[PDB]
Design a protein around this nucleic acid. Sequence first.
RNA 1: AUGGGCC
RNA 2: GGCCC
Length: 476
Amino acid sequence: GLIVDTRDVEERVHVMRKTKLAPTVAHGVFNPEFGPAALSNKDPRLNEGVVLDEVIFSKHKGDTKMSAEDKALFRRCAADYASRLHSVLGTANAPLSIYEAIKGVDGLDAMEPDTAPGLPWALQGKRRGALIDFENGTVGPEVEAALKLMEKREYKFACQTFLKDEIRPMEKVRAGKTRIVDVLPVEHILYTRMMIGRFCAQMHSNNGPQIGSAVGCNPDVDWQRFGTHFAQYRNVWDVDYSAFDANHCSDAMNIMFEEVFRTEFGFHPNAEWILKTLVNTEHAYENKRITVEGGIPSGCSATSIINTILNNIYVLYALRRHYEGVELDTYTMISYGDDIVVASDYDLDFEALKPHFKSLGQTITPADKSDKGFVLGHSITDVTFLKRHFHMDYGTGFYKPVMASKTLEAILSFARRGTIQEKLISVAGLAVHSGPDEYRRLFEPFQGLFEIPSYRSLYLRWVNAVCGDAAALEHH
RNA sequence: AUGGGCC
RNA sequence: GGCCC
Ligand SMILES: [Mg+2]
């Protein structure tokens, strides 16, 4: 986005500056080029001279202003994608009740009871549990009043800035490229779920290529559905973005909210408003109040869906800005936020699409960096989606999500105190697709120390998950 | 150390 | 409690 105002109000938003992540027994064995991101300016691992809280916001390098002609085309692509989207999902997008927003509904998980509260509830020493009854699904006086303000459309707020405590490639930890988390007031997240909760639940249920969204999918069982789909096309592209979230221009966001969340589609008038509040935001980091125009907050209730929707429109826009007579059936794509996989039978020139994505403020580059640019002829087994490859399982013939051995090694190298055992079992679900030999090697360091699931058991669990009949017929 | 997803 | 974005 574009930093338009930097202030120094006399109230610290003390940030958390000590990692919960610690090396495991595997760290000594795998020696990964990874490590927990820097949370403090006084981190010895940082490069001398690097000011953490200057690199954090360095991602905001402006807010691209689209011309009248470009804006007209974008609206035309937004409406077209919306048409497809609401054609599959339906028009049942009525506001969720205060109760359903908290407890959640079929296709939508419940709100986190004990996580960050936001402002100014943090400055007043209050957790979420004090403002909202997460059991019965009722709200306190504070939220109550705020919700009314949002109905009147007069509600203002500030985004709390959090240092994302996670494992990152050493080079970026040493550069100070710590990702940031935009914590929004709990009432804002609640109301957003009230406005578009029904819709989000529908997208999750109807995930797939036809709506261009993988949000809500289960890689275990859906890699077969996505795999056989893309394997039918001549060309498959693995496109990457740089600062996808931050580079959403205000023009694009506004038009997207206006075209997708119209009342005629079964939405509440305030569905469009609440989303537009994400466009112009004020961020509170310690003593500095930074006003940002453009970009998308990280802590939004539907950040992933918003990013995915945009991603779909961007592609349609870029293709229509370069070629003539481009429609939604000219290509196919699956998206999860900034993660994207495109496919088509036409020999599209993605390298030529570069300047067209720039008109949106986005910068595109080919995933694999062996080729100096986008190339044709790639298939589904060449690309990567959700940090997973598309590999064929010889025993079943189905596609299986396989993560790189380095990634898994990095994942198993670090863990937060007292959760090692529960993580191992979770990672085993990811590793199992790397084969018996690789699975065995990765968990070697943990043998005797923790319970490790047998490759056999997790393989059998998978076969039934992806196709029960196949597991049933296997007992002919 | 957060939003949504999935086990 | 983990992973993904
Ligand atoms: Mg990719």
